Amino acid sequence: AIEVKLANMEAEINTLKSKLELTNKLHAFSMGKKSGKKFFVTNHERMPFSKVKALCSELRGTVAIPRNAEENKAIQEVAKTSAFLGITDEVTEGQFMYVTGGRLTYSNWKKDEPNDHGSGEDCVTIVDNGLWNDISCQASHTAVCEFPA
Amino acid sequence: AIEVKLANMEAEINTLKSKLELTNKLHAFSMGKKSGKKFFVTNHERMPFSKVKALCSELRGTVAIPRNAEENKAIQEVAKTSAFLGITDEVTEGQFMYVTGGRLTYSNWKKDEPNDHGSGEDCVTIVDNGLWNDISCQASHTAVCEFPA
Amino acid sequence: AIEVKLANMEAEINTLKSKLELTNKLHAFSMGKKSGKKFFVTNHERMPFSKVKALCSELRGTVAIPRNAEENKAIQEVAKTSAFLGITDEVTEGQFMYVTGGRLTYSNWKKDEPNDHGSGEDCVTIVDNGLWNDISCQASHTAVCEFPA
Ligand SMILES: [Ca+2]
Ligand SMILES: [Ca+2]
Ligand SMILES: [Ca+2]
Ligand SMILES: [Ca+2]
Ligand SMILES: [Ca+2]
Ligand SMILES: [Ca+2]
Ligand SMILES: [Ca+2]
Ligand SMILES: [Ca+2]
Ligand SMILES: [Ca+2]
Ligand SMILES: [Ca+2]
Ligand SMILES: [Cl-]
Ligand SMILES: [Cl-]
Ligand SMILES: [Cl-]
């Protein structure tokens, strides 16, 4: 009996695991996730970069990163307003790197940017028309997380 | 080995508890929940107050309750139209109480409200400009639920 | 130990099943599902009919099918643009059938439609009028899935 009860419970667990994965898929679909594309989402809350990283990380996601023009637009329509991107030049000034590793490939800088203005700007925000501006990491901007395709 | 399978089941169950919690957090984030703030949700359906209470309760939430101006604005944005609040003077005419207990403190009544008009009005709806009006609990207004910060 | 732990895990599993069901109810509510009404959802992506079917099937739903004028309007409101319906005459030209099975009990064809125009049209799209037009199953239109009341 015990071996049988255990086997039956293992079957229930597998079913429940599939049901939760279905829940995640239906949720992403309902929130706009496109086939074969990363899922971008925001709660429309503005906060310093460190908080955005902690928040996305707590959801098992990462701060949104545009790898190409298409993703840059996708992020732009989700945010609506100025939002941090998962990019910083904290290591070597002028050398922007993804918070998940690697050198910046695609970029969409606004004219005269990046200018590492004032006391310094090592974070990046996507703003009007999807263009980018480097800004202080301590400034508050919209939190946008990304989840894998 | 019976005990080995049992220990794996325990790990499978704890992994699922953690993943469901992550799924709940992501959904709340996607629906606009701000850090440290309770969040509001609606399906935009209009119904009598008793139905709204029953629906929210079943979801382990309560009819939305504005505790201050920020929350009042957040509920107004979510609702988009007249919606019941978790406030009534059903128990003792004239004394509004939160559905979850306690006397009403912060309020945002329209001029000349509440007035327990006619045969009586024991419920409350947030309306235009976000101001409040006491209304019949039998009237149908938008169902808006709140969930804990 | 063994038998007590086993009985506890059965309760842990049932608790998780109840919690997941609640999570699903909350997600549907936030998605706009109305009491006793089936609900339609979209990620706003446009794709060929075969991909819409594969996508909704994977989410355990079906391609949206209006059964009366109310549901037809509801699908029209969710899609916002042209969207495939779960109706085709792929099996026998001229005979439209629900993907779930059977002959139509309701239709809202635009004048002189369906006409299997040009190279052929075996799928159906609800347009920006609520009216229907048969169109190529290979053309890309908005994916709208349906889930039970
Ligand atoms: Ca620097
Ligand atoms: Ca810099
Ligand atoms: Ca700058
Ligand atoms: Ca009274
Ligand atoms: Ca009077
Ligand atoms: Ca009263
Ligand atoms: Ca009144
Ligand atoms: Ca044909
Ligand atoms: Ca045809
Ligand atoms: Ca046609
Ligand atoms: Cl900085
Ligand atoms: Cl009343
Ligand atoms: Cl076709």
UniProtKB/Swiss-Prot annotation, chains A, B, C:
Q: What is this protein called?
A: Mannose-binding protein A
What post-translational modification does the entry describe? Answer: Hydroxylated on lysine and proline residues within the collagen-like domain. O-glycosylated. O-linked glycans on hydroxylysine residues consist of Glc-Gal disaccharides bound to the oxygen atom of post-translationally added hydroxyl groups.
Q: Where is the region Calcium-dependent carbohydrate binding?
A: 113-121
Domain comment (free text): The helical collagen-like domains from three protein chains assemble into a coiled coil and mediate trimerization.
User: C-type lectin domain spans which residues?
Assistant: 54-149
Per UniProt, where does Ca(2+) 2 bind?
A: 113, 115, 121, 133-134
State the oligomer form and interacting partners: Homotrimer. Forms higher oligomeric complexes formed by the association of two, three or more homotrimers. Oligomerization occurs in the endoplasmic reticulum. Interacts with MASP1 and MASP2.
List the range of the whole protein covered here.
Answer: 90 to 238 of 238
Annotated source species:
Rattus norvegicus (Rat)
**Which UniProt keywords are given for this protein, alphabetically ordered?**
Calcium, Collagen, Complement activation lectin pathway, Complement pathway, Disulfide bond, Glycoprotein, Hydroxylation, Immunity, Innate immunity, Lectin, Mannose-binding, Metal-binding, Repeat, Secreted, Signal
